[PDB]
């Protein structure tokens, strides 16, 4: 009908006008007198061996000592970073795994992939072994990311254009967030666990609120898929990485774009992004086997974590900001510092 | 310079490492095949001869074949295809009886072109299966092949199945210096549909071994 043709267009024009009218200056202009961070040099302090295939995801424990890694060889390993010892090695039922998570309390872990099912494993058992605590089903596409709200809730996103908030004990879909138009490739949870953002192959990001379960803001500007997304520690900004070789910093409160991190020599697509504890650095893992460190407030490269022989698939920063773990397709995790 | 608990933890880690190595060695001696098709193009029949991913295991001449079917994935194909980068062969199912219904053969040709020239599958041989031989002959008895291939110019007999159908599908691999295509006609009941896969896999494995040796 004519409504879809005209009302949507005029509302979009109004949104554009409102966004433009609320742009007094740019972040670059404001942060012109800030002294540059200077060259950043990081050396591989630990290398973790034991995976026999590509690594597709990893997550740091809440205590910044234990981490979990998932690969296509069908194993989910838990490493003690300080000494590189192995604490657990869970054999998955389906070897097509494309995500993993670590519960904040450290009891459970989660994983999923091409089987469209999210498996939740329990670590603290009286029998001394690790057994599947629960299996959550109800997604009609591959599952690409999962994060723990707490010991009894979890949010997942799949290649179905929908996100779902579950209830582990009952095993049902407590809430379903819909509105995208393409595969949802990653999501991040706000520090206060009240809002969360998701980026999709629609070339856009959306900000949902967990309680009411409804879209609240849509951020556009990219020109291709989005493969990663992360919140700014403050909780009022998030950074997205796409396939057009460019990162972007979006602001929730201003409802606009702030800055874009790109370089002419870079043509490959990003696979993961993360922030530093103070939010003054933005680490991004590219597809050319490198991993750059951008000055978040100036968009000037400050270093390069070149130590991998294949794609950098996963990237993470500890809770206390003392280490950076990068896992690549050569079946290696490296902890810098 | 380590406490007793630390030494026990190191011992446990070494045991876990041994178990992981043994499992990897066991799993590296298996043949992996990826099955692709245009839909209801005889896939079920081929599976019979031997949610999401569907895995089928079978054994032949002391070899373990794992066949992965991805028919249930309606999402974008360019975001999870790179998972299957190490597969040793891509079985492709096509129906010669679809040249009349609707055009379907053009869709199969487009899918074959997309898969065969993918960045990741630049070194994996393709085993091509042509199905519904008897039905195709029965239909070509009356309908002509020009309905689907207007440029075709030849007699209307099953002997022209190997011509302008096999040739058309084998002409799409624009990188002929690194991968090979094996085509085999099949029917409802042949009993040799698994021998052909064995021969193709043996050739691929010989090539891989020679390449690893450096001779190539």
């Amino acid at each position: 009908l004519d409504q879809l043709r005209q009302e949507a267009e005029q509302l979009k024009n109004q949104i554009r006008d409102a966004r433009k009218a609320c742009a007094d200056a740019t972040l670059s202009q404001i942060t012109n007198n800030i002294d540059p961070v200077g060259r950043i040099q990081m050396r591989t302090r630990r290398t973790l061996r034991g995976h026999l295939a590509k690594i597709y995801a990893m997550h740091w424990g809440t205590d910044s000592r234990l981490l979990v890694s998932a690969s296509q060889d069908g194993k989910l390993i838990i490493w003690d970073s300080y000494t590189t010892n192995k604490v657990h090695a869970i054999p998955l039922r389906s070897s097509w795994v494309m995500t993993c998570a670590y519960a904040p309390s450290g009891n459970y872990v989660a994983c999923g992939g091409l089987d469209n099912i999210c498996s939740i494993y329990n670590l603290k058992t009286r029998e001394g072994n690790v057994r599947v605590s629960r299996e959550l089903a109800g997604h009609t596409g591959y599952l690409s990311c999962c994060r723990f709200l707490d010991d009894n809730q979890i949010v997942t996103s799949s290649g179905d254009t929908t996100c779902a908030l579950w209830d582990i004990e009952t095993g049902q879909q407590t809430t379903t967030f819909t509105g995208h138009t393409g595969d949802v490739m990653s999501l991040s949870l706000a520090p206060d666990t009240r809002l969360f953002v998701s980026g999709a192959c629609d070339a856009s990001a959306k900000l949902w609120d967990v309680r009411e379960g409804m879209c609240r803001q849509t951020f556009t500007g990219h020109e291709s898929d989005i493969n990663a997304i992360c919140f700014f520690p403050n909780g009022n900004a998030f950074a997205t990485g796409s396939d057009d070789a460019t990162c972007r910093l979006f602001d929730l409160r201003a409802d606009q774009e702030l800055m874009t991190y790109s370089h002419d020599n870079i043509i490959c697509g990003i696979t993961s992004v993360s922030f530093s504890k103070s939010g003054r650095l933005l680490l991004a893992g590219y597809d050319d086997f490198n991993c750059n460190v951008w000055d978040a407030l100036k968009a000037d490269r400050a270093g390069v974590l070149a130590g991998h022989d294949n794609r950098v698939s996963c990237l993470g920063v500890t809770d206390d900001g003392m280490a950076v773990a990068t896992g690549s397709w050569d079946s290696f995790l490296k902890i810098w510092n | 310079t380590l406490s007793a608990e630390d030494k026990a933890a190191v011992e446990r880690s070494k045991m876990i490492d041994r178990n992981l190595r043994e499992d990897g060695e066991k799993a590296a001696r298996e043949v992996k095949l990826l099955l692709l098709g245009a839909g209801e193009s005889g896939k079920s029949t081929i599976v019979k001869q031997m949610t999401g991913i569907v895995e089928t295991h079978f054994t032949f001449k002391d070899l373990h074949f794992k066949m992965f079917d991805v028919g249930a994935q309606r999402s974008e194909r360019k975001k999870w295809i790179h998972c299957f980068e190490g597969v040793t062969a891509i079985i492709f199912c096509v129906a010669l009886s679809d040249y009349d219904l609707v055009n379907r053969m053009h869709e199969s040709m487009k899918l074959f072109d997309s898969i065969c020239n993918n960045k990741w599958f630049t070194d994996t041989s393709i085993i091509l299966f042509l199905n519904k031989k008897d039905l195709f002959e029965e239909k070509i008895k009356k309908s002509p092949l020009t309905i689907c291939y207007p440029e075709y110019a030849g007699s209307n007999t099953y002997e022209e199945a190997a011509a302008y159908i096999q040739c058309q599908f084998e002409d799409l691999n624009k990188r002929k210096d690194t991968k090979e295509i094996y085509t085999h006609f099949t029917c409802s009941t042949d009993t040799k549909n698994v021998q052909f896969v064995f021969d193709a896999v043996t050739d691929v494995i010989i090539k891989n071994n020679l390449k690893d040796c450096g001779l190539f």
Partner: single-chain antibody
Amino acid sequence: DVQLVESGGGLVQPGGSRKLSCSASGFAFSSFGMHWVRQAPEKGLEWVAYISSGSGTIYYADTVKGRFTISRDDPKNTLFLQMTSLRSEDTAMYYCVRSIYYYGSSPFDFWGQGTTLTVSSSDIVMTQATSSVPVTPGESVSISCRSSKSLLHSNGNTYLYWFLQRPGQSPQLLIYRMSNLASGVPDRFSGSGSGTAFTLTISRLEAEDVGVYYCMQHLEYPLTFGAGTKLEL
């Protein structure tokens, strides 16, 4: 349910031989190291042997070196201890303890039930000055344990375990590493102290708390237990 049941005890003559068996049901016996711990008739506990997971490590006490043998059979989930050339000082009640070692784990969670054996005719010295302490319910109590050598390793951990043994029962773990609280223990119990001086505090004391409290070290493998403090009334 998790349980260990043990057998092979009875009268024996000096110079004889005997075998003790401990059967485990309810947990992954293949991933747990196993200790054999003695308990004299009316005295404190004493460590007798240790066998690791995979049988790659075996340790014996200096008093039974070369005289006892310890083995495990995973397929049938059994633990064997062969004793040869018994002496009149070997009369005791042997236990069967489990322990799994990994970061954040808890050793000595479960104790067996005990088989009574009767025979007819450099080490850290943990000290427990107090022996008897009369206490009334509703009050708070403190138990002090001292060691001959500092128990604070370079890792920052401090290996010091507190066990409780009620009358006519096997000991149960209360605290591991002087701070952590064993699973299932009420929150009243707490532990504190620096190297070479440790204390355990109970705030509200209930009827089901009378027993004997033992403090053990885990730094050097010739494990040593304290004399033991008992609470009365």
